[PDB]
Amino acid sequence: MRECISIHVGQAGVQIGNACWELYCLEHGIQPDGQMPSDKTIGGGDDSFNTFFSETGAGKHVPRAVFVDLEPTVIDEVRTGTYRQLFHPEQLITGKEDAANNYARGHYTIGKEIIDLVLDRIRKLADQCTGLQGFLVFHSFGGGTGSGFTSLLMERLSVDYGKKSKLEFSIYPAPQVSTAVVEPYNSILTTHTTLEHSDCAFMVDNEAIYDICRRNLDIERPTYTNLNRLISQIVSSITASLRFDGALNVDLTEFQTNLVPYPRIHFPLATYAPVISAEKAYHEQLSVAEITNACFEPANQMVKCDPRHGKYMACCLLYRGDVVPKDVNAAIATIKTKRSIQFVDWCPTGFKVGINYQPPTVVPGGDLAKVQRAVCMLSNTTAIAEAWARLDHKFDLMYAKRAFVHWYVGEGMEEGEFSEAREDMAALEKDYEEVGV
Amino acid sequence: MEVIELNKCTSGQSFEVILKPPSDPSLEEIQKKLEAAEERRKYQEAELLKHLAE
Amino acid sequence: REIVHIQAGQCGNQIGAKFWEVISDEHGIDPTGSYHGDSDLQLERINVYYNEATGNKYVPRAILVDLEPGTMDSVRSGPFGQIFRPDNFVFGQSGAGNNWAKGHYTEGAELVDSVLDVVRKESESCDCLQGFQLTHSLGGGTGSGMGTLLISKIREEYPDRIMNTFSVMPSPKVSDTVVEPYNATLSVHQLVENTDETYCIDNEALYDICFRTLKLTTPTYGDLNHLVSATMSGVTTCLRFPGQLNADLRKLAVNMVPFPRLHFFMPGFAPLTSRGSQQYRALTVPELTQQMFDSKNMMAACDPRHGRYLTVAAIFRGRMSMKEVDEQMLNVQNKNSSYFVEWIPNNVKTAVCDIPPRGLKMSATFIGNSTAIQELFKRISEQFTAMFRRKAFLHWYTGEGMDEMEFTEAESNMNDLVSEYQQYQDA
Amino acid sequence: MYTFVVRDENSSVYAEVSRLLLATGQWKRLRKDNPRFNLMLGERNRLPFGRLGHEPGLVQLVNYYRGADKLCRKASLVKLIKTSPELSESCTWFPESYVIYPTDEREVFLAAYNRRREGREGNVWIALISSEASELLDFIDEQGQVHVIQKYLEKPLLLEPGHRKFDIRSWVLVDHLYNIYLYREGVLRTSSEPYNSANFQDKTCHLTNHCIQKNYGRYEEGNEMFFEEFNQYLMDALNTTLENSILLQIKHIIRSCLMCIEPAISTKHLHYQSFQLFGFDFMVDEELKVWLIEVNGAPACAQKLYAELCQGIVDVAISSVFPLATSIFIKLHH
Ligand SMILES: Nc1nc2c(ncn2[C@@H]2O[C@H](COP(=O)(O)OP(=O)(O)OP(=O)(O)O)[C@@H](O)[C@H]2O)c(=O)[nH]1
Ligand SMILES: Nc1ncnc2c1ncn2[C@@H]1O[C@H](COP(=O)(O)OP(=O)(O)CP(=O)(O)O)[C@@H](O)[C@H]1O
Ligand SMILES: Nc1nc2c(ncn2[C@@H]2O[C@H](COP(=O)(O)OP(=O)(O)O)[C@@H](O)[C@H]2O)c(=O)[nH]1
Ligand SMILES: COC(=O)Nc1nc2ccc(C(=O)c3cccs3)cc2[nH]1
Ligand SMILES: [Ca+2]
Ligand SMILES: [Mg+2]
Ligand SMILES: [Mg+2]
């Protein structure tokens, strides 16, 4: 067994981290106080769930996780939440005042004062690791902490842990649920600095999750709580192969191998189905074909875009529940003949399939109904470049007038870093297009 | 069409089906960037304090 | 996340007292300083503006400043007069005679250190001070002259702290002396340099609202200040109550201020209510939204159709459908998208608090960063020039050591501010 | 009051459309780069589809189908046809064509060129119009461009009097629900010169769009014969109607092309939606068999029909999405 350390940065990262660890506990039969009645090896062991949990002699299973925010409100809700006993104080790191949606403040000003402390608390987790794979890093693009401190953390992790893999779960900014206006700056800045330090990054657009919540969960005005429970389900689907017995995506390294042939283009599109309201008094359970076909509807993607007008480089199907290989292949054959699925010529047209017999666990009192089978598709399509196009355009609109730039310069950042970041993004969009058309 | 590398266990199974074959900065430089920005802040603050002194 | 409050001069102390009496009621604090409310929501962020006293009393983090004791004695004998920390009353005896020079250079200079001592004493008690706020007028001598002197010295001792002002602009309609354009012009340049937010509360607009809309035939300063305290309650709701928004002063300013000098806001409020006059039908969300964007609810007496919105913030209070809020807000913009700049994407932001103010089942506070605010400064500039052409009333200032050059400079950098607004209006 | 932007100033059709919208008083025009639009009359090159449908609370519609260029390019149409089971490759209404690149299916083309060299036939082709394979291939190699080699219809239907050649242009509107509407008014873009069988660089003789022709205006005003006249001619000269002899095939071809690419371009479940006006060009041989020549994604209209067509576009493509406070189209059912 090889361990994985989770790092949650800023408000978005922390609250999503909480939703995920809550879900993890329910899935592995771990109680809020850290006890796991089914774990017969008291005080240790190297089972698959031990990738994410370590054990105390008293029998408590604790998350290999560190929480970091430059302001205490959100992490304090972990300290006093229902899973307060799960973590120990040294996993929760808080600052005094936040980065105020300012990357430069997250990266340079405040980030410099706390980076050594964070790395120290991370080191203490790594010391209890017999064989560390690397890190899963959760954060927003838009926050000053989420963008600024994360990119600095990623740089140092590449230094202190050179051969370890680093994966991102990144919240892409959406105006519907944000009161910020400078997020296009922070996103481009943090993507430029982190790009070489990240092996695989799963982007989640709040716009997509928002509409999925409205359309399929019938929630009129989705809150962060609604958004995070759904996001945690997707994240769980992606990490389940690291926490359970299996042969697909059992290592962080395998995520790059299976999903990322070209290093810079390491942003796989996630699609999830089915999403069913728990208030839906009568639901006809969906078949393998129906949920697999739904993986090619844009309305179910974590980022709204059109894969028909792009090219695939890789594609994984991760099923949970009552699913057998025969019905998957039968579904794929029909979907192939009915849909536009184009691979790049230097890649085989195919699917790597993983099946876990345990159906998705839902949070009691949540919005999601229990289903007999669910699927998460991870596809590396060039169509996700539409998201960079949107972002870079908003960046260009503001930066031409140098709007809000003084806030960044005032924290010690140089104006040229804006243009350097934007040029790197310009290169990225062109990489996607060469591969894509 | 062709199902390969099928692996089974009690928790589930995995396989691969093919439809068709084909056709870093150092600690030194990091700490220098962080300290260059801190200087620019301290320079900007000194220009403000000098201005207020006037 | 403590905020330190400062009120300077007659106007500053009168709207300041009003502000503290309004939010004390919202937080359930009585004039003795004792909490008697029925919601924990009232106390969750009460430390932002209040200090906890042994014997569970809450003491406003407020510093009261004047160059004469007249108005501050009225405060101490006012409704909530006894709630303030007695040591935080800092006052001289000589007065300022509506003279910026007296407030900024002579009389105020003699008292300013004493004020800073109290500021420091209140700051050192703060776990993490997020910033300062100041209430004052620009047309007199103390609030205008000593207030900006104060702001300059606070920025010297706390260069990394947010400073926001609620500033009452002078108008011939509601006028005390003829030298108000002089004092205002001198003050505006100080504000351009040393504040992060300045809420431009125009006495002209406040008058017109009380008259044309609230149908008060002879409005007093008291009527005018009812609108101000109601607006200040709304502007700070975000900070005083839990909800969608938990930004500190800095984060709030970052998303509202695209250029450092253009931080003068047009505030607004809906529904517009005169004091005492109850009315029983609450507004529908389309009514709230349409009024808060209408010029008649603006408190800066500028026509927003004569400029363009750089950023807009709106806070809705009460029990209501935010989905309906979303639709009406995006109704207004998509209808009038020519009065919003197109190079700042999604520059119109909204938030809701469940707790309505006293007397209303729902309300909305408007905060517009419009280029139309240049009309306010052009107005002051014209009135400045009309007298300065003939060097009229200048002897009041030269007698305190000021030179004509300082006026010429003040005049020029306000004209720069005006032209700077014109630059982005045509972008 | 809805909003729209205009990003193609040289569109004859949508200049007319935008003015119709304004004259309703329920549509307001914004300028080019204002993202808060309901309707986008977009540019023809590099239209930013990826930025559509991401404005909260705004239904967005664009007058172009993303991906429809595979139908509206000559190199693409041949390949789209040739590789799609719904059409190809025994497709009876599309001329034998091949994809040729300058120094690909070059070897494939001459394998066909030979066998009715190698016995019986007309072997005239087009890109220039020639009968000699060699004369085309190094025409093609000093253009630079990628060209298409297509069998020349040596037996076209010829209008009398005049012994003239012609091509038929049909206008097809596809709405956001992928309804296929055929404009009841087509036009015959005729040749004013009599057709010359023997010599082929006559080109005034062999090429029929209303640019080259300007014997102009001899028979009909502007070398444009509309459907009422052409129908009357078919009745008088051939004892048949336009509907039976030609239009059934046209309707069949239009529906078949658009049904093929529907799954590739449909916006039924997208976050934005599309409609698009197409111009189908047909060719009729002497046995009243219809052939598809090409498809234009940015067609212009005939002058008399601008008022009717553009009004039709507003009614069923735009007002169907954004309503306001017997039909000129034939719906090709599927
Ligand atoms: N999905 C999701 N998005 C969130 C959540 N919280 C904040 N966001 C998004 O994150 C962006 C704002 O960044 P935050 O994470 O809140 O800020 P931060 O990382 O704490 O950084 P600073 O507050 O500036 O120091 C906005 O676009 C929000 O929509 C959350 O709980 N779930
Ligand atoms: N295979 C063929 N056989 C006979 N004639 C043909 C032909 N292909 C084209 N033509 C003639 O050559 C002319 C030019 O063809 P083409 O359609 O390529 O021009 P074009 O691209 O300008 C049409 P549009 O302007 O509507 O897009 C047509 O008008 C037709 O008369
Ligand atoms: N809105 C409002 N304006 C006032 C009030 N009192 C004075 N003013 C205005 O403030 C200016 C006079 O400044 P004042 O505060 O009296 O001078 P100071 O005491 O020396 O600071 C004039 O423009 C008055 O119209 C008040 O209570 N409310
Ligand atoms: C005392 O100083 C302030 O209150 N400044 C201040 N600046 C502000 C900017 C915005 C808001 C606000 O309520 C928002 C509503 C919707 C988006 S921001 C509130 C603010 N308050
Ligand atoms: Ca164990
Ligand atoms: Mg934060
Ligand atoms: Mg006075």
Task: Give yes or no: residues D183 and D193 share one domain.
Answer: yes
Angle between helices C374-388 and C404-425 (to 10 degrees): 150
Domain boundary (A360, A383, A406) is at A383
Do C128 and C170 meet the contact criterion of CB atoms below 8 Å apart?
Answer: no
Same domain for A168 and A226? yes
Q: At what angle do helices B27-53 and A111-127 cross, to 10 degrees?
A: 150
Which one of D126, D148, D206 would you pick to mutate in the ligand 2 pocket, going by the greatest count of ligand atoms within 8 A of its CB? D126
Q: Is D180 found in the same domain as D322?
A: yes
Domain end point (choices D109, D129, D154)? D154
Q: Which residues of D touch A386 (CB under 8 A)?
A: 49-51
Check whether residue A45 and residue A143 sit in a common domain: yes
- Whole-angstrom CA distances from A25 to A18, A190, A233, A252, D307 are 11, 31, 13, 21, 67
Of the residues A366, A383, A400, the one at which a domain ends: A383
- For residue D237, the tally of other CB atoms under 10 A from its CB is 10
Within 8 A of A385 by CB-CB distance, chain D residues are 50
Of all ligands present, the nearest one to the C-alpha of D209 is 2
Instruction: Enumerate the β-bridge partners of residue C171.
Output: C174
Annotated binding site of C for GTP: 10, 68, 137, 141-143, 203, 225
Distance CA C400, CA C412 (A): 22
Task: Give the Å distances, CA to CA, from D211 to A39, D152, D272.
Answer: 83, 21, 37
- β-sheet bridge partners, residue B2: B18
Cα-Cα-Cα-Cα dihedral sign, residues A294, A295, A301, A305: negative
Strand order in the sheet with C309-318: C89-91, C62-66, C3-8, C131-137, C162-169, C197-202, C264-270, C362-370, C309-318, C348-353
Q: How many Cα atoms are found within 13 Å in the side-chain-facing hemisphere of B53?
A: 6
Which of C337, C346, C349 to substitute to test the interface with D, most D CBs within 10 Å?
Answer: C337
| Sheet bearing A373-381, strands edge to edge | A269-273, A373-381, A312-321, A349-356, B12-20, B2-8
Nearest to A273 by CA among A257, A289, A260: A289
Judgement on whether residues C242 and C318 belong to the same structural domain of the protein: no
Tokens 């009051």 appear where? D1
Same domain, A300 and A432: no
Residues D86 and D172 in one domain: yes
Residue C27 structure tokens: 């937080």
Tokens of D294: 């090409």
Domain shared by D40 and D179, yes or no:
no
The secondary structure of C200-231, three-state, reads EEEHHHHHHHHHHHCCCCCCCHHHHHHHHHHH
Q: Is D16 in the pocket of ligand 2 (CB under 6 A)?
A: no
Q: Which of C258, C289, C305 is the endpoint of a domain? A: C258
Read off the CATH number of the domain in which C407 is found.
1.10.287.600
**Based on the domain organization, do D209 and D302 belong to the same domain?**
yes
Q: What is the CATH number of the domain that holds C143?
A: 3.40.50.1440
Same domain, C14 and C105: yes
Do C334 and D57 form a contact (C-beta atoms < 8 A)?
yes
- Please choose, from the candidates C10, C303, C5, the residue with its C-alpha nearest in 3D space to the C-alpha of residue C170: C10
**D232 touches D240 (CB < 8 A):** no
Contact by Cβ (8 Å): A275, A300? yes
Residue indicated by tokens 């050192």:
C124
For the record, the structure tokens of C245 come out as 């928004």
Query: Side-chain half-sphere of A236: how many Cα atoms within 13 Å?
Result: 29
Residues D220 and D271 in one domain: yes
One domain, residues C408 and C272: no
Q: Are residues A52 and A170 in the same domain?
A: yes
Give the whole-angstrom CA distance, residue A376 versus residue C266: 49
How far apart are alpha carbons C425 and D13 in whole angstroms? 34
Phi, psi of D265 (to 5 degrees): -125, -10
Same domain, D168 and D137: no
Q: Return d(Cα C113, Cα A336) in angstroms, integer.
A: 79
Give me the CATH number covering residue A401: 1.10.287.600
Q: Is C23 in the pocket of ligand 4 (CB under 6 A)?
A: no
Give the integer Cα–Cα distance in Å for C54 and C34: 11
Q: What is the 3-state secondary structure (H, E, C) of D122-188?
A: CCCEECCEECCHHHHHHHHCCCCCCEEEEECCCCECCECCCCEEEEEEEEEEECCCCCEEEECCCEE
Q: Is A339 exposed, middle or buried (0-12, 13-18, 19+ CB in 10 A)?
A: middle
In this structure, the answer to whether residues D30 and D121 fall within a common structural domain is no
* CA–CA separation, D300 and D114 (whole Å): 39
Residue A284 a catalytic site member: no
Q: How far from C355 is each of C25, C41, C410, CA to CA, in Å?
A: 12, 9, 43
- The two tokens of residue D263 are 């799954």
CA–CA separation, D137 and C317 (whole Å): 76
**Total Cβ atoms within 10 A of residue C321:** 13
Q: Does B30 touch chain A (CB under 8 A)?
A: yes
D83 lines ligand 2 (CB under 6 A): no
- Number of structural domains found in chain C: 3
* A-chain residue closest to C310, CA distance: A403
Residue D202: Cβ-neighbour burial (10 angstroms; 0-12, 13-18, 19+): middle
Residue-range definition of the domain harbouring residue C378? 373-427
State how far Cα A232 lies from the chain centre: 9
Same domain, D255 and D290: yes
List D283's β-bridge partners, or say none: D291
Reduce the secondary structure of chain C to three states and give it as a string.
CCEEEEEEHHHHHHHHHHHHHHHHHHCCECCCCEECCCCHHHCCCHHHCEEEECCCEEEECEEEEECCCHHHHHHHCCCCHHHCCHHHEEECCCCCCCCHHHHHCCHHHHHHHHHHHHHHHHHCCCCCCCEEEEEEECCCCHHHHHHHHHHHHHHHHCCCCEEEEEEEECECCECCCCCHHHHHHHHHHHHHHHCCEEEEEEHHHHHHHHHHHCCCCCCCHHHHHHHHHHHHHHHCHHHHCCCCCCCCHHHHHHCCCCCCCCCEEEEEEECCCCCCCCCCCCCCHHHHHHHHCCHHHECCCCCHHHCCEEEEEEEEEECCCHHHHHHHHHHHHHHCCCCECCCCCCCEEEEEECCCCCCCCEEEEEEEEEHHHHHHHHHHHHHHHHHHCCCCCCHHHHCCCCCHHHHHHHHHHHHHHHHHHHHHHCC
Within 100-159 of C, beta carbons closer than 8 Å to B belong to 152, 155-156, 159
Give the end-to-end CA distance of chain C in Å, rounded to a whole number. Answer: 38
| Among candidate residues A251, A207, A254, the one with its CA nearest the CA of residue A231 | A207
Which one, of A252, A243, A55, A20, lies nearest residue A134 by Cα?
A: A252
Does D45 lie in the same domain as D70? no
Whole-number Cα distances in Å, C104 to C42, C107, C140, C180, D210: 39, 7, 11, 15, 81
Q: How far is CA A161 from the centre of its chain?
A: 21
* C-alpha pair distances (Å), D52 with each of A431, D48, D55, D62: 22, 7, 8, 8
Taking a C-beta distance cutoff of 8 angstroms, is the pair A195, A162 a contact?
no
Strand boundaries in chain D, DSSP class E: 2-6, 27-29, 39-41, 61-62, 97-100, 125-126, 129-130, 147-151, 164-174, 180-183, 187-194, 224-226, 273-274, 276-284, 290-296, 329-331
Four-residue CA torsion sign, D18, D21, D25, D27: negative
CA–CA–CA angle D307, D309, D314 (5° rounding): 95
Same domain, C362 and C285: yes
Name the β-bridge partners of A317.
A353, A377
Structure tokens at B51: 């201005």
DSSP A296-349: G-GGGBSS---GGGS-EEEEEEEEEES--HHHHHHHHHHHHHHS---B-TTS-E
> C390 has which bridge partners?
none
CA separation, residue D131 to residues C255, C311, D78, D212 (Å): 70, 69, 21, 22
Calpha distance A178→A172 (Å, rounded): 11
- Same domain? For A63 and A40 the reply is yes
Assess whether chains B and D touch, using the rule of 3 or more C-beta pairs within 8 angstroms: no
The Cα C208–Cα C198 span in angstroms is 21
Task: Decide: helix, strand or coil at residue D268.
Answer: coil
Q: Of C239, C257, C141, nearest to C192 (Cα)?
A: C257
Closest atom of ligand 4 to A179 CA is 17
**How far apart are alpha carbons A144 and A148 in whole angstroms?**
5
D311 and D162 within one domain: yes
- Scanning every residue of chain C, which has its alpha carbon at the shortest distance from the alpha carbon of B52? C156
Please state the φ and ψ torsions of residue A24, each to the nearest 5 degrees. -55, -45
CA-CA-CA-CA torsion sign (D262, D267, D268, D269): positive
CA D290 from chain center: how many Å? Answer: 14
Q: What angle do CA C219, C220, C225 make, to 5 degrees?
A: 105
Closest residue by Cα to residue A184 from A408, A13, A384, A393: A393
Please report where in the chains the tokens 């020519």 appear, as a residue.
C338
- Residues A202, A321 share a domain: no
CB C160 within 8 A of CB C27: no
Number of structural domains chain D divides into? 3
Chain centre to alpha carbon of residue A224: 15
Asked if C129 and C183 sit in the same domain, the reply is yes
Q: Which residues contact A272 (CB under 8 A, 6 or more apart)?
A: A233, A234, A237, A300, A302, A374, A375, A376, A377
Contact by Cβ (8 Å): C169, C187: no
Ligand 1 pocket mutation pick from A8, A11, A186, A202 by most atoms within 8 angstroms of CB: A11
From A27, A155, A254, A290, the catalytic residue: A254
Tell me the structure's resolution in angstroms, rounded to a single decimal: 2.4
Chain D neighbours (≥3 Cβ pairs under 8 A) are A, C
Whether residues C322 and C366 share a domain: the answer is yes
| Closest to C28 in 3D by CA, of C53, C1, C46 | C46
- Using only C-alpha atoms, chain C has a radius of gyration, in whole angstroms, of 21
Task: Using only the alpha carbons of chain D, give its radius of gyration.
Answer: 21
* Rounded Cα distance, D53 and D31, in Å: 18
The rounded distance, in Å, linking the Cα atoms of D217 and D8 is 31
**Structural domain ending residue among the three candidates A383, A407, A429:** A383
What CATH number corresponds to the domain at position A319? 3.30.1330.20
How far is Cα A36 from Cα A31, in angstroms, rounded to an integer? Answer: 6
Q: Are residues D202 and D244 in the same domain?
A: yes
Write the CA distances from D274 to A48, A212, C253, C387, D40, integer angstroms: 49, 22, 40, 63, 10
H/E element, D107: helix D106-114
Mutation target among C112, C154, C156, C409 for the B interface, most CBs of B within 10 A: C156
Same domain, A255 and A283: no
Q: State whether the Cα torsion C183-C185-C190-C191 is positive or negative.
A: positive
Method by which the model was determined: X-ray
Residue D31 main-chain phi, psi, to 5 deg: -95, 165
CATH code: domain of residue D141: 3.30.1490.20
Which residues form the domain of D205? 64-95+155-334
Q: Which helix or strand (DSSP H or E) is residue A136 part of?
A: strand A132-140
Chains that touch A (3 or more CB pairs under 8 A): B, C, D
Same domain, residue pair A363 and A418: no
The torsion angles phi and psi of C293, rounded to 5 degrees, stand at -100, -10
> Alpha-carbon distance C202 to C211, whole Å?
14
Q: Are residues C362 and C387 in the same domain?
A: no
Read off the CATH number of the domain in which D39 is found.
3.40.50.11480
- Chain position carrying tokens 């759904």: A230
| Domain interval for residue A430 | 384-437
For residues A218 and A356, is the Cβ–Cβ distance under 8 A?
A: no
Contact C194, C109 (CB under 8 A): no
Asked if A243 and A52 count as a contact pair (C-beta separation under 8 A), the reply is: yes
Residue A134: which H helix or E strand, with range? strand A132-140
Spatial separation of the C-alpha atoms in residues D209 and D220, rounded to whole Å: 14
Sort residue D25 into left (φ over 0), alpha (ψ -120 to 50) or beta: left
Q: Are residues A39 and A121 in the same domain?
A: yes
Ligand 7 centroid distance, CA of C11 (Å): 7
Both A392 and A332 in a single domain?
no
How many degrees, rounded to 5, is the angle at CA C174 between CA C172 and CA C178? Answer: 45
Q: Tell how far CA A98 is from the center of its chain.
A: 22
Helix (H, G, I), strand (E, B) or coil at D195: coil
d(CA C187, CA C179): 13
CB A343 within 8 A of CB A237: no
**Type of residue numbered A407:** W
Same domain assignment for residues A203 and A277: no
What's the rounded Cα separation, in Å, for the pair A310 and A435? 9
**Closest to D189 in 3D by CA, of D144, D234, D221:** D221
Answer for the pair C314, C278: CB distance below 8 angstroms, yes or no: no
Q: How many CB atoms lie within 10 A of CB D22?
A: 13
Residue that finishes a domain, picked among D154, D180, D204: D154
Amino acid sitting at position A270? A
Q: Which residues of A touch D56 (CB under 8 A)?
A: 175-176, 207
Domain count, chain A: 3
| Boundary residue ending a domain (D87, D120, D154) | D154
